[PDB]
Structure formats: structure tokens, C-alpha cells
RNA sequence: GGGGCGGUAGCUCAGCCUGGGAGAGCACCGGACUGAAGAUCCGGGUGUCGGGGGUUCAAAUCCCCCCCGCCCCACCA
RNA sequence: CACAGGUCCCAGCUAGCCCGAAAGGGUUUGUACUGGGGCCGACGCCUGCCCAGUGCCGGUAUGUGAAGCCCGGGUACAAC
RNA sequence: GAGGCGUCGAAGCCCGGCCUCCGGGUCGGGUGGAGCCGUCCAUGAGACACCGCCCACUCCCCGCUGUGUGGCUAACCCCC
């Protein structure tokens, strides 16, 4: 294919679950491209995924959110 | 076809249809040929009199040039009331003066349509027209209808409301007052239906009771068929 | 043009002039607006060749190919002779080193020999007229020949409303070149279409000669 | 509609009567002569303290246009909900002050000033602080030259007068000017 | 044209942010000129569709590439939402169009709080018990 | 008879002037989606697109002759 | 049958409606508490629902819609 | 009609105004400073070789003539 732009960004820390399936894991990503640099989102991720791994971001512009949370 | 109807009968200023001129009361007359500008003239209430058909009030005034006209009365004279023609006329009730001389927000009467033909609008018992908005171009005046007329700035108007109000507040009660009111005004009566009226009398209705063709008539209809409802852009009280 | 102006009428002898201050040879043109014409069906439109007295003045290159006493005929003349095969060569390779297309201006048959013109040669040359075509005469070897080899000038009407004909290149005399001029202008006044002012204007014009109106 | 650009038309502003000519705002807009009357927000970036920090947003009209260049006189003020919403305290009171000026110069203004109290003690001393700063202002406006006056009314110099002498009666804190609309234009003499 | 000294031009966009549409709007600082409106529904092929946060940043992208044409690149923000006949906080447009306009290139200027909120009371919808679900 | 408009995939039509193998949504079959159903997406195709004939390599709309409905007129010895 | 009461409708007066071959005229020494036209027919309680059809009213891009003028054609002009 | 163009001053660099399908052409400044094109062929139909007249939308100074809107006041009309 054509690229697009893949964003990489590599997840900085794992805030908690969001889905009521629970299916999401919103996790906190920093990035690491040659655009932006730096930008720090929170994205809601799927799947096994532990810190520090790597995602490809298809759309730099989201960062939806929902937050709490443990006692 | 059947014969002329009520109303074409009323045109033709034949007598049963033609006002009385000889029980009936001076008409309303400010004269301009003493001008508005350069103003000499007031003039004291001779006396208070009922005109029959303006079913209202009217003043017999004596001038101070020597003329003697009538103005339609205004709510709260006296008889011995000084009365002022001009615009250098004080601003107070029954005192008269042009339109761009009266203050903005107040209640006005007897107001000019042409400068200096008289008083051709508001002369009724109780009924009053509001100064809204004023400009030196056009000053426009709120009618007894709701509905706003512009007039030039430079007609006569006098200050206050009309006497005579209450008027349809109090009923005409039978049909033999009413009968001697009509007399003193005109008005064709009693008044029937066209309802029962034959094929020849009426456009609807026949022997027995129920209308003929619709009671809602055209604008381009013709003499002697717009009866009813004329030109109704809606009719009834409900969607 | 500053040697004459452009809605002046001359005569037909007149208009035919030359100035030219240019490498280039004047070229000779006529341009002619028809009115009331339109394709409100495209057949009626004006198409013939006119043969010119006194030729264009440029050379023809005829291809004649013919078989019977109809190439006795052709051979005559001082045609070549050539056969049909070479239309199989024609069509067949779509070549870029020696390909026979943009390389000539007529073709003349006799009609058993149209069907095959048709396929073949149609592919590149197309109606830019290097074959023959039936609503113009060049197929019949024995008048077309005749006729082409004096000069024959090619016309057609672009529905809408301006047919022209230019006549050829000047390698003629001017009173030569009239003669041209008045010929292909008694062609045109001759396809009959009704309505006042039928022939609109007609101009004679050149390279760098005078552009000059004329009376039609 | 269907525009090259070419039919748009630009016009530059040129704002005083507060200040002089300000080259801030541009205008575009479609045929000639469609901005008369028309209005533009400016902050103002003249004195670059307290009118863009705290009088963010003030409205300008153009009164006339010559030769596609608009001069513009002051037509308001007015201020956000943020400013509003932030100063309002509970326990306590916001205090709202009209008056109706007139100047020397045959021109009225109308200023609404928002005072607010500090804390405890809600008294008549409220309507003579109300009492105070209209008396003052009409006889502010009939001494000065109403464009000096217009640039006092939207700089802190008036916020800081009604307080001196408003604090002596019953202390208040976080005085300001809310809004400013310009009553009546025209002149003393028409 | 008539000479410009600035060499920059300033257009004031207001977005008013529903809860059943979004829309993006951007006119020049005057406001008399409309460049831009364009609102979600055009994006999409449905009303569940029509507000959304997408919506919304496409809705922004869409108008402020005319603006560039113009040579409009500085933007005032101004937001608003429907205070008189429904509730007065913004929905998802809000936080949609800021992104929008970063992402576009667009420089951002004052982003502002011109919702209406009236001084008054009004009769809304709803009584008895108020609007029961 | 004159003038104009619409007749197109099962359906309703879109693309006249603004030209091509060409269309869109809805019915209908299949796949996503929710505990469920529905709605809402994603596939699938059904007309060279009213007949017949002509210019164009290629025309639904262009051209010559038209069926049918529709609307306004004119007209019936 | 009138009738008091109720309602619908129209008109800013250089009006609306109506009479008159015309000039002109009635209402009108009248001006919206007027004055003109219909419906219903004292009081008491009420007067649901429908604009599909008829009627009236407001408006009408589009199609359409005369004579006139215009342009084209015709006629040496004209009819057409 | 395969040659026109080029001190009858050319490429090819650097911008300026430009419409636009931003497809890409057009064009004034200047550096320059001596070449550029198609015949060739593909393309259903060939030349941004050149020369004529056109058929596209479209825009404009001027000459004639309609129509719409507003201002004016000298006809005419309603008031004194």
C-alpha cells in the first residue's frame, strides 16, 4: 500500500478499562514519528498489551476519555 | 333574474336611505386660512352640545376672529375652557397643534390626513390614536385599528381623547330603543335575513331555511352578488 | 493587417494580392459564412470536391489500385499500378520505422475493392479523406483519375453556419488564382438553402496579403 | 455567490476617537458599499496592560467608508461570561449601577458598572454606593470632552475613582465596568 | 484589491454545538461575510451520525481549507450552543474543533464564551412532574 | 392540432442545456452490530439506461418518426 | 317574520360597499365605541371533529398564457 | 499547409499579475544569449510548425433599444 501517515507511538503507562464489555484499554501513549514528536494521548487501545509496546496510530486527532477508578 | 338587492337600493340616495341633514350637527372645520404658522387665534367652549349622528359629544367654540365652528369635544372640558389653534397653542387636553409640536408617547385625536382639511380622522366617541414614533420626515400615528398610517408632520391634531366613551358598554337593550337611535342616525331596520328570503329577493337562500350557494364571495365579484362574508381570507375560530 | 482593412469589398480578381514582409509562401484561403444551416440533419450539409481550373498548384499524390481493363486504363495515364495487398501492410503492423500513414492524400478503388478500404485503412486514416468515401466522388478509376491529377479542392460544412474551401498555395498568377476563386464560390452559391442573406459574407485571405472582404 | 475572487472587495480599518487611526481588522465583503453600518470586534492592542488583559473585547461600527477605507467610531463595549461568572461570590452581594449620561458635547452614553461587596453587612449603604457613582459620572461627563471620557469610562480610571470614594462608605473589592452602549449619537445641535 | 499592511487576515468562526448537529461556520472579522458553513450532517449518511466528535473535526477541516484560499489564517473562536430553548453547555464540537483547527494548520486566537445565557426566566417544555423520561 | 414536461434497474427517480463501458436510495438475498428485536452500516446484481431508425469511436439527454400519461391553449363540416 | 344578545367578514376616508350613459351621486354635517355586509336569533349550559370536495383568501420559481412590440421567414409592399 | 520561428533577438534559470479541470496554459520584470519544433508514429480524427474563419463560457469601453427601482416637478388629479 500507500502509507498514509502511520504515527508510531509507543504506550507510556496503562490508566485502567473502559467498556462495559470491558474491551477497551485506555492506555496513555507517547510518540515517536517524524510530524508531531512528544505528543502525549490518551487512546483507547484493544488486546493484549503491556507497557512500552508500539502502536501505529491512523488518526493523530482523537484522544477520547473517560477516567475513574480504584479507591 | 330577481330584482336589486338591499344594498344596491342604499346607492341610489333615495330617501328611506339617505341621511337627515336638518336634525343633524356641524362637522368639524380648523380653517387654514389663518394659517397654522403665524397663529393669532384661540377662541372660549360657547357651549356643549350632542350631534345625533356621531352618537358622541360636540363643542360649539367661538373664536377670537369671530367665527363660529364646531370641534369635536374632548373627555374633561369645561364650558368656559379656552381652546388654542396654532402651534405656539399650549401642550395641554383640547388644545390643538401640529403633530411635530405634540410630544412622542402621547394620546392625540381630530388628526389631519392633507394639511388643513379639517379633521378626517378620529372623531369618534372614545377612541384615540397614539403618537408612536416622530421624525421630521413623516410622523407616523397608531390608528384605533392597531394599525399604523403615516401622515405628514405638518397636520393638526388636538391633545387628549374624544368624550362619549363607554359607548357599546352600555346596551341598546330592546328593540324599541334600538329603534329610536336609528331614526336619530340612519340605518336601514329592522333587518332581515336572506336566508328565507325567495330566489328573486336574495343571491342565496330559498323558500325555507338553509343557504344556497356559499356565503364567501370573490373581490372581483359582481354588484349585487358580493353579499356575505366579502373577500374572507378566513372566517371561523378554529385551525 | 495594415495593408488593408477587412470589411472592404473588391472583386474576386482584386482581393487576391500580395505583401508579405515573411519566409513563409502566402497561402491562399476562402472562408465563407452560410446562413439558415444546421444539422437538424447532418446529411444536408454542402460535401462535393470541385475540380479547379488552374489547380492548386501543389502536387497530388495519387495511390490508384485496379484490376481489369479498368488498370489498362490507370496504366495509361502514367500511374504506377499498385496492388491491394499493400492494404493487409496498411493495417496489419502498427509500426514505428517505415509505417505508410500521414504519408499521402488520396486513394482512389474500384467499388469491389471498398469493403477492404473500408477495414483497413479506415483504423489510422479515418475521414481525413485518404481513402475514398462514397458521398464524395474518388472511387470509379475512369473520371476521378482524370479529374484529381488537375487539382481537385476538398470541401465540407461545419454544421454551424461556416463552410470554407481554400483554394491552394500561390505558385499561380492572381487573375490565375481568381479563376480558382470564382469556381469554388459557384459551387458553394449553387447548394440551395432558403432564407434572405444565404451567403452572409465571404472573405478572401492569405499568410500576410491583404484580408479583405468581397462581394458574394 | 460564484465569485472569481474578484468581485469581493477589501477595505482596511482605520479606527481613533479612542486612539488614533488602528490599522487592526480587515474587512472583506461582496459588492461595493455592503459594510456602512456594519460592526467589528477588536480587543484593542494600543496599550497592551489592562485593555487587553481585562476589557477583552470591544465593539466599533463603521460609521462611513471614503475611497474603500472605513473610519469607525465607538459603538460599545461589553464583556463574557467568564469575567461575570468568575468575580460573583455568595454570602455577600453583586451590585449593578445605571446611569444615563449626558455630556457637554450633545452626546449620551450609558455605562452599567458591576461592583462587588465585601462580604458581611447588606445595608441601605448598597443604594448609596448606587446613589454615589451616578452622581459622580454626571459631573465627570459634563466637564470633559466625551472622547476623553469614553477612554476614561473603559480604562480602569473610572473602576479606580468609584472606589475611592465608594470604600469610604462601605468597602467594596472588584470594580469594573460590565458594559457601555452609546444612548444617543447625534449632536447638540442638529 | 486595496493595498493590506498587515500581509495577515483574521476571520471570527462561531460553532454552535448541538447535541443532534454540529456545525462549523467561519466568517471575516466583520462577520458580514459568509466564507464557510459547513455542518455535520453533510459528512455523514445518517442523524446518529450527525453530532459525534468525527463529524465534527471533518465539519471544521472542510471549511478551513476555503480559509486558506482567502488567506485567512488566523481564527478567533467563539462558542455558543442553544441557551434560550434548550440547555446552554457545548457538546462534542467543543473539544472536536479546537483539534480540527490545530491539525488543519490554522492558528487558534481567543477561544470564548458567547453562549447565550439569559437574565431572564422562560416557560421550556416540561411540567407536572417537569419532562418525564 | 400547437406548445411544454415526465416516462430508466422490481420500485421511485438522478444525470436536459451540463456528452463516454456509466447512476442513487428503497424493496429483495448475504455479512457486521446488540442478552434480545429494531434501526444503522458493509457486499450482490437486476436498464448503453421508453421503441425504432441517424450523426458520434463511444450519446439517456443531440437528430428524423414516435407510444403513453400529464398540463395550458386552439378546434370539431 | 322582526327582536334584544352572540359571531364571522371588509375598509385608513384620495377607503371599502353601493347608485349613475355621463357628469356625477348615496353613506357623510359619517371616520374603526364608525359604517357597510352576512349568519344566528332573549337568558342558562354549550358549541366536538374534518381543508378530501366546493367556495374564499394569499402567493407563485416552473410550465402555460392574448393582443402589442421584436426578431426570423414571406411578400418589389401587404396578407401570411 | 511539414516547415515556420529564431540581432524581424531563442532556450533555460528568478519572481511579479492570471484564469482554471490547483489538468496545466497564458502572461508583464529581468538574468541571458543562439536555439527550438514535427516529418517520425502512436491516436476513431494531428499538431502547443504556421495561416484563416468559427462553434464554448465568459467579460468589457462605445452606438441603439426595451424593461425594473428610486429622486424631481412642468402635465394631470384630491384640499384650502
Not at chain 2, 71 to 100: F, K, M, S
Amino acid at each position: 500500500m500507500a502509507e498514509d501517515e502511520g504515527y508510531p507511538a509507543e504506550v507510556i503507562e496503562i490508566i485502567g478499562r473502559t467498556g462495559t464489555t470491558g474491551d477497551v484499554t485506555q492506555v496513555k501513549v507517547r510518540i515517536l514519528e517524524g510530524r508531531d514528536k512528544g505528543r502525549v494521548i490518551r487512546r483507547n487501545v484493544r488486546g493484549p498489551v503491556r507497557i512500552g509496546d508500539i502502536l501505529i496510530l491512523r488518526e493523530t486527532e482523537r484522544e477520547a476519555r473517560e477516567i475513574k477508578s480504584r479507591r | 333574474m330577481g330584482k336589486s338587492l338591499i344594498q344596491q337600493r342604499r346607492g341610489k340616495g333615495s330617501p328611506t336611505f339617505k341621511s337627515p341633514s336638518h336634525r343633524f350637527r356641524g362637522a368639524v372645520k380648523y380653517i387654514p386660512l389663518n394659517y397654522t404658522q403665524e397663529k393669532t387665534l384661540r377662541g372660549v367652549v360657547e357651549e356643549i352640545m350632542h350631534d345625533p349622528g356621531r352618537t358622541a359629544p360636540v363643542a360649539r367654540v367661538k373664536f377670537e376672529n369671530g367665527i363660529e365652528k364646531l370641534i369635536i369635544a374632548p373627555e374633561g372640558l369645561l364650558v368656559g375652557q379656552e381652546i388654542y389653534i396654532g402651534p405656539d397653542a399650549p401642550i395641554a387636553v383640547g388644545n390643538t397643534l401640529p403633530l411635530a409640536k405634540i410630544p412622542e408617547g402621547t394620546y392625540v385625536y381630530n388628526i389631519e390626513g392633507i394639511p388643513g382639511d379639517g379633521g378626517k380622522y378620529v372623531r369618534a366617541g372614545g377612541t384615540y390614536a397614539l403618537v408612536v414614533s416622530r421624525e421630521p420626515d413623516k410622523v407616523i400615528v397608531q390608528l384605533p385599528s392597531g394599525e399604523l398610517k403615516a401622515f405628514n408632520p405638518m397636520c393638526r391634531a388636538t391633545i387628549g381623547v374624544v368624550a362619549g366613551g363607554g359607548r357599546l358598554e352600555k346596551p341598546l337593550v330592546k328593540a324599541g330603543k334600538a329603534y329610536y337611535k336609528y331614526k336619530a342616525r340612519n340605518k336601514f331596520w329592522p333587518t332581515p335575513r336572506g336566508v328565507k328570503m325567495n330566489a328573486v329577493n336574495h343571491p342565496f337562500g330559498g323558500k325555507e331555511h338553509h343557504p344556497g350557494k356559499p356565503t364567501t364571495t370573490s373581490r372581483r365579484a359582481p354588484p349585487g352578488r358580493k353579499v356575505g362574508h366579502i373577500a374572507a381570507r378566513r372566517t371561523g375560530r378554529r385551525k | 493587417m495594415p495593408f488593408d482593412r477587412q470589411k472592404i469589398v473588391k472583386a474576386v480578381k482584386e482581393a487576391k494580392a500580395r505583401a508579405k514582409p515573411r519566409n513563409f509562401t502566402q497561402s491562399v484561403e476562402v472562408a465563407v459564412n452560410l446562413k439558415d444551416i444546421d444539422l437538424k440533419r447532418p446529411e444536408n450539409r454542402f460535401k462535393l470536391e470541385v475540380v479547379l481550373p488552374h489547380g492548386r498548384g501543389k502536387d497530388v499524390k495519387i495511390a490508384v489500385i485496379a484490376d481489369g481493363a479498368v488498370a489498362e486504363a490507370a496504366r495509361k495515364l502514367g500511374l504506377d499500378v499498385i496492388s491491394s495487398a499493400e492494404l493487409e501492410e496498411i493495417a496489419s503492423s502498427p509500426r514505428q520505422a517505415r509505417k505508410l500513414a500521414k504519408k499521402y492524400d488520396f486513394f482512389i478503388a474500384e467499388a469491389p475493392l471498398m469493403p477492404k478500404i473500408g477495414r483497413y485503412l479506415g483504423r489510422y486514416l479515418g475521414p481525413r479523406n485518404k481513402m475514398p468515401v462514397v458521398v464524395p466522388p474518388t472511387l470509379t478509376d475512369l473520371t476521378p483519375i482524370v479529374e484529381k491529377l488537375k487539382k481537385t479542392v476538398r470541401i465540407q460544412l461545419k454544421n454551424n453556419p461556416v463552410v470554407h474551401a481554400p483554394v491552394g498555395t500561390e505558385k499561380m498568377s492572381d487573375e490565375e488564382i481568381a479563376e480558382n476563386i470564382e469556381a469554388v464560390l459557384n459551387a458553394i452559391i449553387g447548394k440551395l438553402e432558403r432564407g434572405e442573406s444565404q451567403v452572409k459574407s465571404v472573405y478572401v485571405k492569405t499568410t500576410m496579403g491583404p484580408a479583405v472582404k468581397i462581394e458574394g | 455567490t460564484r465569485d472569481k475572487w474578484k468581485l469581493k472587495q477589501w477595505y482596511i480599518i482605520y479606527a481613533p476617537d479612542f486612539f488614533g487611526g488602528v490599522e487592526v481588522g480587515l474587512t472583506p465583503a461582496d459588492d461595493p458599499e455592503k459594510v456602512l453600518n456594519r460592526v467589528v470586534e477588536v480587543t484593542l492592542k494600543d496599550v497592551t496592560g489592562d485593555f487587553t488583559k481585562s476589557h477583552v473585547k470591544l465593539y466599533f461600527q463603521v460609521y462611513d467608508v471614503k475611497g474603500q477605507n472605513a473610519y469607525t467610531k465607538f459603538k460599545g463595549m461589553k464583556l463574557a461570561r467568564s469575567y461575570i461568572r468568575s468575580l460573583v461570590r455568595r454570602k455577600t452581594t453583586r451590585i449593578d449601577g445605571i446611569f444615563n449620561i449626558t455630556t457637554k458635547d450633545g452626546y449620551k452614553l450609558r455605562v452599567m458598572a458591576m461592583a462587588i461587596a465585601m462580604r458581611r453587612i447588606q445595608t441601605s449603604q448598597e443604594r448609596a454606593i448606587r446613589k454615589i457613582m451616578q452622581e459622580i459620572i454626571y459631573k465627570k461627563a459634563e466637564e470633559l470632552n466625551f472622547k476623553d471620557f469614553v477612554l476614561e469610562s473603559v480604562n480602569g480610571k473610572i473602576a479606580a475613582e468609584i472606589a475611592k470614594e465608594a470604600k469610604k462608605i462601605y468597602p467594596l473589592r472588584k470594580a469594573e465596568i460590565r458594559k457601555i452602549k452609546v444612548l444617543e449619537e447625534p449632536q447638540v445641535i442638529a | 484589491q486595496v493595498n493590506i499592511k498587515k500581509k495577515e487576515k483574521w476571520g471570527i468562526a462561531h460553532i454552535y454545538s448541538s447535541f443532534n448537529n454540529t456545525i462549523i461556520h467561519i466568517t471575516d472579522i466583520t462577520g458580514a461575510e459568509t466564507i464557510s458553513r459547513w455542518s455535520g450532517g453533510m459528512v455523514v449518511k445518517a442523524d446518529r451520525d450527525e453530532p459525534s466528535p468525527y463529524a465534527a473535526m471533518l465539519a471544521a477541516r472542510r471549511a478551513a481549507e476555503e480559509a486558506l484560499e482567502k488567506g485567512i489564517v488566523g481564527v478567533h473562536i467563539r462558542v455558543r450552543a442553544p441557551g434560550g430553548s434548550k440547555s446552554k453547555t457545548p457538546g462534542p464540537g467543543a473539544q472536536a474543533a479546537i483539534r480540527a483547527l490545530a491539525r488543519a494548520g490554522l492558528k487558534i486566537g481567543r477561544v470564548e464564551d458567547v453562549t447565550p445565557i439569559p437574565h431572564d426566566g422562560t416557560r421550556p417544555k416540561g411540567g407536572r412532574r417537569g419532562r418525564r423520561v
